[PDB]
Subunit: 286 residues, 2 copies
Amino acid sequence: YRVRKNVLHLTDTEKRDFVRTVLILKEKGIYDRYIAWHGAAGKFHTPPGSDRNAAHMSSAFLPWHREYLLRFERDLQSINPEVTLPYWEWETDAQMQDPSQSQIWSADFMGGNGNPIKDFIVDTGPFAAGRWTTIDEQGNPSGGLKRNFGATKEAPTLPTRDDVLNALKITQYDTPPWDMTSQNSFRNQLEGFINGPQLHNRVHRWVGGQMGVVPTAPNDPVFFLHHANVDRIWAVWQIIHRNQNYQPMKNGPFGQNFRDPMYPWNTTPEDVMNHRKLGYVYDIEL
Amino acid sequence: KYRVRKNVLHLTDTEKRDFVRTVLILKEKGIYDRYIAWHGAAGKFHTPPGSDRNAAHMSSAFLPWHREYLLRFERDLQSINPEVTLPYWEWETDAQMQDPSQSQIWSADFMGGNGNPIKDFIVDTGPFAAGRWTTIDEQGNPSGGLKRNFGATKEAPTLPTRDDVLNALKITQYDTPPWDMTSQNSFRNQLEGFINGPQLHNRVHRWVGGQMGVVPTAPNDPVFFLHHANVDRIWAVWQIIHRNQNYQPMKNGPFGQNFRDPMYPWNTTPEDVMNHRKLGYVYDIEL
Ligand SMILES: CC(=O)N1CCC(Cc2ccc(F)cc2)CC1
Ligand SMILES: CC(=O)N1CCC(Cc2ccc(F)cc2)CC1
Ligand SMILES: [Cu+2]
Ligand SMILES: [Cu+2]
Ligand SMILES: [Cu+2]
Ligand SMILES: [Cu+2]
């Protein structure tokens, strides 16, 4: 009942209402809760000793962020019942010679790249320094939003459309030991550790700035449109592989299994396996 | 009103045994680690960023946060054993003793004893000793055992007394602006222990030492829950005395500190946990 559109197919009002609603949540102090939640899960290892955490590098990577975006979208609609979370189709932006000139990086939406003159501090758009305060790992002020498109050796370019399709061809959702080293795994493949960095992981490194590391990534509002696309690819995969379900169903590390509570919530992957059941849908399904 | 919360000294041998085992079950399942993480995560959620106030401490939300914290915890106990309830450690009566480190609460059948100076004060007695109990650090990585150092600090060589508790109950205002560590004439700040600190709640932490000495790793010691159960009790008693004194601020305080503001990392508000009886439990001193 709640359509989630593509950024390029948004009206000027839809772009305006979305941005404005985010700034309100920021002013209310609700936005910082999500920044903290994301960082808090990143240090919750399942189990302690492994490199697997509640939100990343394991099987719960996809359902966690789905619930994450869901709650966020719910807080959006508590302000404006018409606003929904759009998605950034970065696989299509890769077609451009220079993706930074895309309409998603316009001054009326997310702003542009960082300014090399000003330590790559974002000085354009509604989320520039002085109009948008960011925090660091410890929860202290950091001094502005940063962005450095394709300035990394491991990720100088965005992933391609072919990368997305090759990921959808995978049969298993995930494979043991449900981590960074999982092979033939759609979860691990979409995350981006298969000959990394790729896809989701590559996009983070590509954007740079706060998006470059896990604990500070949600400081950039593009984080939510990026994962909305990640959530879409997962949704499409479920539609293709109707007979394939979430893995592991159990006996994986606690907090990674199908009926396990996902820190820091009581929500289980089962509770968020069907995005239609959650009350939203993507425009490509219509 | 149906779930009695008793005193550790008033517990049977069976009740102590059942409680301890239940804690060990939650630990093995991986549920216990959630609370350690929750506590540490709120300690770095500053309200607002820049200030010394966090979601769980050094502010007005200190008391309702831990009440909800203990509430959720007590519920996870009953998911295992529906008869087990969370006891409280009356540290004010232990202060009466010549040596508090001799309380029956520090016996091998409950919480174990003090730390071993030979092995960096690692606990080697009780059900939560090294090898029977794994602990984690700030970053969420294994730390290698529980520590305890009773009264080894200059600013907290002794536990707080009954008079400290009484004098705190004599305070009229729940809290005062700027609703933080420097609040004066505040029951919250008093009971927390920043008034000539460390005192009361804060002093107990520093007294026990080890993981209990710092905020992010404090829940690694199961005594953390019996300690805050006593802190919650004193708060409950204060509410009974001053029935028309309510939570402050009702508004205009930092977000997450107000009466109807969600307490990170939950959606629970101080209003939702203002009446402990409505939460489904009571303390034995009320009967
Ligand atoms: C490939 C690589 O080493 N990285 C490490 C950094 C990481 C960044 C990141 C940030 C937030 C997330 F929720 C997930 C991942 C991307 C993958
Ligand atoms: C007085 C003092 O400086 N402290 C700092 C250390 C702190 C310990 C502590 C641990 C966990 C809590 F939930 C609350 C408090 C007690 C107060
Ligand atoms: Cu994430
Ligand atoms: Cu991400
Ligand atoms: Cu605490
Ligand atoms: Cu405490």
